Ligand SMILES: CCCCCCCCCCCCCC(=O)CSCCNC(=O)CCNC(=O)[C@@H](O)C(C)(C)COP(=O)(O)OP(=O)(O)OC[C@H]1O[C@@H](n2cnc3c(N)ncnc32)[C@H](O)[C@@H]1OP(=O)(O)O
């Protein structure tokens with residue numbers, strides 16, 4: 370259908386038909402001297418803008434913008450609540466630039482009415498290093514939808530990034546578009562089933578009673594794992610080396626330096642429990658050789674439409690890593706596959722205890738990576754929403770996000786997708 374995308378049909382992206390043999394760039398090489406130094410045009414009523422995260426009324430402009438016009442569920446009763454803190458983490462990774470925090474203020478009043486964003490990252494498509502940028506936070510004010518302002522924001526953020534000599538991008542979106550490299554599904558391990566129920570995040574399956582469900586989803590008040598401790602700087606190297614090792618396993622990943630890792634996993638110390646964004650943990654055995662690591666972050670829902678409650682606490686399982694299976698085999702071979710499982714099913718379970726204890730009403734995950742071994746087992750239910758990963762200017766061989774054709778967790782053949790968008 371690429372032809373019906375009046376805009377996308379002009380972009381360096383893979384296609385629906387097109388099968389590939391050799392993964393590589395889509396445009397004939399370019400160089401910054403080739404790119405325009407002039408920001409694109411926009412109706413006279415509006416002026417481009419650049420957002421300094423460290424400016425307080427600018428962060429404020431964005432936080433408000435997205436807080437009222439960003440992504441909602443398919444039925445519009447819940448909306449993402451990205452907090453200023455969260456922005457402070459995600460928009461300032463190492464290498465970030467204010468020139469890539471593009472805003473679009475209306476000139477007469479200056480009201481921020483559009484945003485699009487890029488932070489730099491280095492991909493690992495089938496192990497082939499690829500200097501790219503990661504895109505996220507594309508948002509246009511509700512009263513400005515359909516004015517086809519988006520292709521501009523893209524055309525403009527692309528332009529700025531080319532000017533820094535980068536030519537590739539990783540972006541994920543829900544809607545279907547040109548080259549889904551892979552796809553995944555969100556799932557939900559209820560922490561506060563009754564509340565989820567009282568705000569219509571879920572319903573009551575027949576033959577069941579709140580007690581039944583409430584008991585069915587019950588979680589221990591204390592984690593069940595020795596060595597289970599929360600990451601510190603001191604660990605980085607072993608951890609980082611551990612993570613690096615583990616993720617080797619997937620066809621599509623981010624190639625974290627050590628710094629743009631520590632930042633990604635240990636957030637600003639100042640912040641209190643109700644503010645904190647990233648929750649990273651590790652398992653330090655007696656001899657020290659920490660063997661386990663997993664993280665998750667907090668990204669609530671603004672419960673629009675409800676009188677019983679105004680906010681939903683949600684914890685998204687982030688990155689994780691474990692030595693189980695590999696020190697064992699070569700192939701992800703059975704005796705080793707199930708070897709991981711039990712160890713995984715044991716980690717995440719504590720993630721759910723941990724997340725629950727941090728006040729998260731529901732714990733989410735994606736059927737990407739080896740999520741599939743523990744999901745069903747750990748009671749992660751099927752979400753109604755899905756996520757599509759894409760690559761701008763790059764021929765990639767379709768990779769795996771854990772879904773059998775009936776959108777069922779593919780427990781056998783897991784997921785080749787290694788990144789985890791924020
Ligand atoms: C190497 C450098 C290059 C780097 C750049 C790489 C690509 C980046 C672009 C992708 C950015 C998405 C990433 C994320 O942020 C995560 S996903 C988070 C996304 N956020 C939201 O959904 C928040 C709430 N929604 C809105 O704010 C939305 O308003 C909107 C901004 C998403 C879309 O704006 P709009 O509804 O007013 O439509 P429009 O008239 O302005 O433009 C339409 C054209 O753009 C495409 N259109 C509509 N929604 C789209 C979407 N989410 N992604 C992409 N295209 C979209 C369409 O396919 C179409 O074009 P066609 O004619 O071709 O069909």
Ligand SMILES: Cc1nccn1CCCCc1ccc(CC(=O)N[C@@H](CO)C(=O)N[C@@H](CCCCN)C(=O)NCCC2CCCCC2)cc1
Nearest residue numbers: 441442444542543555557570571750751752753754790791
């Ligand atoms: C990069 C990025 N980060 C965040 C967003 N994006 C990009 C935007 C495109 C990705 C996207 C769009 C919209 C959403 C919101 C969303 O889809 N929410 C769904 C996720 O699946 C949801 O809340 N599902 C819940 C509630 C929806 C109810 C209203 N329809 C569900 O299935 N709940 C039932 C769970 C239940 C299963 C059984 C066990 C108990 C829990 C998520 C991601």
